[PDB]
Amino acid sequence: DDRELAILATAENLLEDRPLADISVDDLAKGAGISRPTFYFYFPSKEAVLLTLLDRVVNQADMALQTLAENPADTDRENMWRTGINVFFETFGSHKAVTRAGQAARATSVEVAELWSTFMQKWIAYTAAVIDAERDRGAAPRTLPAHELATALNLMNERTLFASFAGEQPSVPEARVLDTLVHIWVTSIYGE
Amino acid sequence: DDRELAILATAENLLEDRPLADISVDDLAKGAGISRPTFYFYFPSKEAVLLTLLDRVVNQADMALQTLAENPADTDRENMWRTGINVFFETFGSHKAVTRAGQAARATSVEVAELWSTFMQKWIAYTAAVIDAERDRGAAPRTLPAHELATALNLMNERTLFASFAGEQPSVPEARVLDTLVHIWVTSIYGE
Ligand SMILES: C[C@@H]1C[C@H]1c1ccc(CCC(=O)N2CCC(C(N)=O)CC2)o1
Numbered sequence: 001d002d003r004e005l006a007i008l009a010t011a012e013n014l015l016e017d018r019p020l021a022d023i024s025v026d027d028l029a030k031g032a033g034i035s036r037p038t039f040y041f042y043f044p045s046k047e048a049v050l051l052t053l054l055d056r057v058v059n060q061a062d063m064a065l066q067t068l069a070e071n072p073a074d075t076d077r078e079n080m081w082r083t084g085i086n087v088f089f090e091t092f093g094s095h096k097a098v099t100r101a102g103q104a105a106r107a108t109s110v111e112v113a114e115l116w117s118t119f120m121q122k123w124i125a126y127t128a129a130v131i132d133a134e135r136d137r138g139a140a141p142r143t144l145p146a147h148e149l150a151t152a153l154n155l156m157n158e159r160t161l162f163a164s165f166a167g168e169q170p171s172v173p174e175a176r177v178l179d180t181l182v183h184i185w186v187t188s189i190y191g192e
Numbered sequence: 193d194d195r196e197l198a199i200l201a202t203a204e205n206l207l208e209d210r211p212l213a214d215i216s217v218d219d220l221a222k223g224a225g226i227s228r229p230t231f232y233f234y235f236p237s238k239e240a241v242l243l244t245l246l247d248r249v250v251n252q253a254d255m256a257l258q259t260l261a262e263n264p265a266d267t268d269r270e271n272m273w274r275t276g277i278n279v280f281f282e283t284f285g286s287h288k289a290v291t292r293a294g295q296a297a298r299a300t301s302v303e304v305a306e307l308w309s310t311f312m313q314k315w316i317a318y319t320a321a322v323i324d325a326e327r328d329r330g331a332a333p334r335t336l337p338a339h340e341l342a343t344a345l346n347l348m349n350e351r352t353l354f355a356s357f358a359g360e361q362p363s364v365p366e367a368r369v370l371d372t373l374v375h376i377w378v379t380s381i382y383g384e
């Protein structure tokens with residue numbers, strides 16, 4: 001495990017400077033202080049190394065959202081949504097290189113695409129359930145189907161966070177993204 | 193030009209069945225009824241063929257939005273936004289294979305990334321100007337900075353349209369996407 005961790009830390013550090021294309025199995029072995037065949041004992045490929053890194057990041061966010069769901073903030077509905085979106089902003093924003101490369105690999109990799117898909121379905125379902133609960137309590141109006149509204153809003157966040165972290169043009173500055181997403185969540189969830 | 197058009201039509205037809213990776217210069221020449229070296233006279237690579245296809249699609253949408261801007265519908269503010277979003281839905285939705293592959297190539301191709309960036313900046317700027325005009329006339333409240341609000345909403349549409357057209361999981365069904373986006377535009381633009 002200590003050497004497995006080494007390989008993962010090396011991959012994360014290198015992904016800060018280059019894409020996964022420009023990183024070889026030899027670069028990973030070298031940084032982890034192991035040989036090439038020893039690398040292949042822990043991981044079958046550099047793609048599997050990414051997949052593991054991405055799995056850790058996605059579970060960290062998922063576990064943080066579970067924690068929030070169990071310990072609701074004693075706060076207004078705007079800060080409720082802000083606290084939830086902030087899980088993603090801080091989690092992925094603390095692992096931008098992994099996040100970016102994990103998104104790029106969605107195009108090439110079946111398991112990476114499936115990992116993203118699974119967790120997106122889960123977070124969408126949760127969002128939809130909160131919206132439904134808000135509607136049942138009379139705080140939000142019955143406008144769009146909750147699960148479609150949840151899907152769009154979650155996709156917005158994915159795209160917008162990714163663009164901000166990558167400093168794409170165009171993008172919302174990183175110091176304005178949370179406010180910008182929360183406004184659009186709150187107005188569209190509560191707006192008649 | 194007739195042979196250039198042939199190559200483009202062949203590329204568009206093939207991209208319906210495979211990604212650009214699985215299409216070779218030989219497949220393109222073959223479908224256009226030309227030789228391989230004759231192909232290289234018209235285009236330097238299969239990437240340039242995509243780039244041309246994508247440029248045509250993006251300009252078609254841009255010209256449609258210009259047309260709308262010059263001939264405003266005599267309609268309420270909700271149908272105003274719907275008519276604009278619908279330009280993208282119908283334009284890109286009529287060229288899904290090109291649209292999808294053009295998005296995939298953003299990761300690999302500098303010119304493709306720049307083409308998308310240019311036009312996104314333009315459509316964001318336009319959106320922001322309409323929002324500002326709506327605020328000046330007192331129809332919309334001064335909430336978020338207009339250009340940040342415009343950026344998020346345009347990124348939402350990009351991601352959501354792409355997912356819908358690709359039938360990703362998760363996605364908004366294609367027959368519900370326009371309604372879903374328009375709701376979120378209108379509530380967030382006009383919602384206090
Ligand atoms: C960067 C990573 C893919 C993108 C992403 C997915 C989901 C999000 C933010 C939205 C999110 O999932 N929420 C928002 C917070 C909400 C809550 N009440 O706790 C429900 C869960 O960002």
Ligand SMILES: C[C@@H]1C[C@H]1c1ccc(CCC(=O)N2CCC(C(N)=O)CC2)o1
Nearest residue numbers: 276277280284315319322346349350353
């Ligand atoms: C599929 C293609 C990238 C994604 C995209 C970009 C922009 C959009 C839809 C939003 C758009 O640009 N609008 C929405 C309509 C609006 C108007 N008042 O005319 C301003 C322009 O979708």
